[PDB]
């Protein structure tokens, strides 16, 4: 149970429109802020939209510290269920760990129409390494800002990362990576060529691992990791809309 109140800007976003739905998943220590411009664009295009707030996110990092990856999965599952009550057709898109959760969801549901992971994380060796090796880490790691090309964007995210939450992320990534072959729905995979957080190599692990018969990669050349708020935002939105229309 969250002990801290939800912060302004971190609210989930819902829009009831047509029978085709899009689930949007934000990232680790992040908030719905990172996916909001996408959610709004898709809503305006006539899609039913669900952008949930991950448990322990958008409140306080102490809440986050208390969560496990199961809680984050449950938050996304709640959004899937909300769409299930309203939509004949469901797409899922997500940034970073949101992309990881997008893959995870496609691995455990048979009726997802398509996925759009954006810089999804499935293998970050430094993380598991540090959780089981190296020296003892502080309880909280200091955030020093978001990986963005555009300097004038401020992402709404925690100023500290609970180290305990890193193990949860590592477990989520490991279990998602192991089950990639269960994914059969069409996939549009975005990857930033320059990325200082997730190795772009992850996109290939995903591309090769999934069983999808229709899969594509779009390499973004004008964005860093937080691409949804970076210069390539218009392309991400446009290509995603084309993807939704192609498969619905």
UniProtKB/Swiss-Prot annotation:
Keywords, ordered alphabetically: Hydrolase, Serine esterase
Impact reported for residue 144 to G: 18% reduction in hydrolase activity for both 1-lauroylglycerol (1-LG) and 1-oleoylglycerol (1-OG)
Thermoactivity: Optimum temperature is 75 degrees Celsius.
Site-annotated residues for Important for substrate specificity: 144
Regulation: Not inhibited by cholate, but slightly inhibited by triton X-100 and deoxycholate. Completely inhibited by PMSF (phenylmethylsulfonyl fluoride) at a concentration of 200 uM.
The keyword Chloroplast belongs to this UniProt entry's keyword annotation: no
InterPro entries: AB_hydrolase_fold, Esterase_lipase, Hydrolase_4, MAG_DAG_Lipase
GO MF annotation terms: monoacylglycerol lipase activity
Active site (UniProt): 96 (nucleophile), 195 (charge relay system), 225 (charge relay system)
EC numbers on record: 3.1.1.23
Annotated positions binding substrate: 28, 97
Catalytic reaction annotation: Hydrolyzes glycerol monoesters of long-chain fatty acids
Enzyme superclass (EC): hydrolase
pH dependence of function: Optimum pH is 6-8.
The keyword Transferase belongs to this UniProt entry's keyword annotation: no
Pfam hit, one: Hydrolase_4
Other known facts: This lipase is not secreted extracellularly as other bacterial lipases.
The protein's role, per its UniProt record: Hydrolyzes monoacylglycerols, with the highest activity occurring with 1-monolauroylglycerol.
Entry-linked PANTHER family: PHOSPHOLIPASE-RELATED (PTHR11614)
Subunit relationships: Monomer.
Family per similarity comment: Belongs to the lipase/esterase LIP3/BchO family.
Identification of the protein by name: Thermostable monoacylglycerol lipase
Source organism of this protein record: Bacillus sp. (strain H-257)
């Amino acid at each position: 149970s969250e002990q801290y109140p939800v912060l302004s800007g971190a609210e989930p976003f819902y829009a009831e429109n047509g029978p085709v739905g899009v689930l949007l998943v934000h990232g680790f220590t992040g908030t719905p802020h990172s996916m909001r411009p996408l959610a709004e664009a898709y809503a305006k295009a006539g899609y039913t939209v669900c952008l949930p707030r991950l448990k322990g996110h958008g409140t306080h990092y102490e809440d986050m510290e208390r969560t496990t990856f199961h809680d984050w999965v449950a938050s996304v599952e709640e959004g899937y269920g909300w769409l299930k009550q309203r939509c004949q057709t469901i797409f899922v898109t997500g940034l970073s760990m949101g992309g990881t959760l997008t893959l995870y969801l496609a691995e455990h549901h048979p009726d997802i129409c398509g996925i759009v992971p954006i810089n999804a994380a499935v293998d970050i060796p430094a993380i598991a390494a540090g959780m089981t090796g190296g020296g003892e880490l502080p309880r909280y790691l200091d955030s020093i800002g978001s990986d963005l090309k555009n300097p004038d964007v401020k992402e709404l995210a925690y100023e500290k990362t609970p180290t305990a939450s890193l193990l949860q992320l590592a477990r989520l990534m490991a279990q998602t990576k192991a089950k990639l072959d269960r994914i059969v729905c069409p996939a549009l995979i975005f990857v930033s060529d320059e990325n200082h957080v997730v190795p772009p190599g992850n996109a290939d692990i995903i591309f090769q691992g999934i069983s999808s018969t229709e899969k594509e990669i779009v390499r973004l050349r004008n964005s860093y990791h937080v691409a949804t708020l970076d210069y390539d935002q218009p392309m991400i939105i446009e290509r995603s809309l084309e993807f939704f229309a192609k498969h619905a």
